[PDB]
Amino acid sequence: VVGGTEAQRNSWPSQISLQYRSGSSWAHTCGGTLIRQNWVMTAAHCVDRELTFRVVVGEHNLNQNDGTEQYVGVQKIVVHPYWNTDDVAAGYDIALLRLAQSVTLNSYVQLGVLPRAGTILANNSPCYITGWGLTRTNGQLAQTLQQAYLPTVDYAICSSSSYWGSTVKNSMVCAGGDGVRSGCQGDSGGPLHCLVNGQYAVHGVTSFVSRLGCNVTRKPTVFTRVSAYISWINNVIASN
Ligand SMILES: *[SH](=O)(O)C(C)(C)C(=O)NCc1cn(Cc2ccc([N+](=O)[O-])cc2)nn1
Numbered sequence: 001v002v003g004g005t006e007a008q009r010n011s012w013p014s015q016i017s018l019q020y021r022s023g024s025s026w027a028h029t030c031g032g033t034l035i036r037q038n039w040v041m042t043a044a045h046c047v048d049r050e051l052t053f054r055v056v057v058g059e060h061n062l063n064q065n066d067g068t069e070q071y072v073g074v075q076k077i078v079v080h081p082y083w084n085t086d087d088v089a090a091g092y093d094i095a096l097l098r099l100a101q102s103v104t105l106n107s108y109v110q111l112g113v114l115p116r117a118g119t120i121l122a123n124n125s126p127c128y129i130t131g132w133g134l135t136r137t138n139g140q141l142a143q144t145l146q147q148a149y150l151p152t153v154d155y156a157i158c159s160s161s162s163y164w165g166s167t168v169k170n171s172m173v174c175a176g177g178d179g180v181r182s183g184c185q186g187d188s189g190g191p192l193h194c195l196v197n198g199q200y201a202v203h204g205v206t207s208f209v210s211r212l213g214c215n216v217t218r219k220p221t222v223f224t225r226v227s228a229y230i231s232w233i234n235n236v237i238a239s240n
């Protein structure tokens with residue numbers, strides 16, 4: 001997250017860190033959202049490389065033991081069957097990870113609330129991106145979870161020629177684009193939390209930023225629109 005602030009420890013308890021094995025340790029690669037005690041929602045592209053993954057719930061400071069973390073293996077990866085790693089712009093950038101064990105829920109570990117199927121947010125709706133991704137274009141990961149206010153940019157604006165044009169689809173949510181605040185590398189897969197009827201729900205899965213930079217005016221961060229995939233998510237959980 002570029003231009004964020006440090007999140008309070010208990011603010012976003014559905015946020016997870018998706019990590020892969022690196023030597024004798026682990027490296028953060030993506031965010032995700034805990035959606036059942038044994039399922040995480042992330043971006044398909046986060047699992048394009050075949051590596052050993054783990055999920056960390058209750059994480060805050062990646063480098064220090066907070067006393068709140070639970071670490072769990074990934075037992076099954078279900079990518080959207082229409083995902084094409086060579087065509088991120090086509091959409092379908094979503095995957096479900098079945099965890100090897102069910103995590104314990106507490107003030108630091110909670111299920112993310114998903115929107116009703118079909119929900120589309122009005123332009124400029126209030127949302128926050130969270131993650132440990134880079135804090136500047138070409139920078140380094142955040143040690144502590146970051147948040148930034150990123151109001152939505154509706155499909156009509158986001159897919160117009162001065163924004164993302166045809167690259168953005170109606171199956172995506174755009175947010176931000178103010179040139180100061182944005183998602184960045186390593187936020188991918190994580191949530192966009194939007195306030196609807198007094199409750200935050202996870203409307204986006206961070207999917208891509210501009211190759212010209214993370215925080216670029218009129219290149220808002222682009223998310224998979226969770227509400228386009230409710231039936232798919234439920235079908236996967238029910239059949240696995
Ligand atoms: S996102 O918008 O944050 C985006 C697309 C810029 C991003 O940074 N995604 C992160 C990501 C994770 N993966 C999978 C992966 C690739 C390579 C390794 N590796 O060890 O070399 C590990 C994981 N791709 N993009």
Ligand code: NA
Pocket residue numbers: 059060061062063064065066069
């Ligand atoms: Na920690």
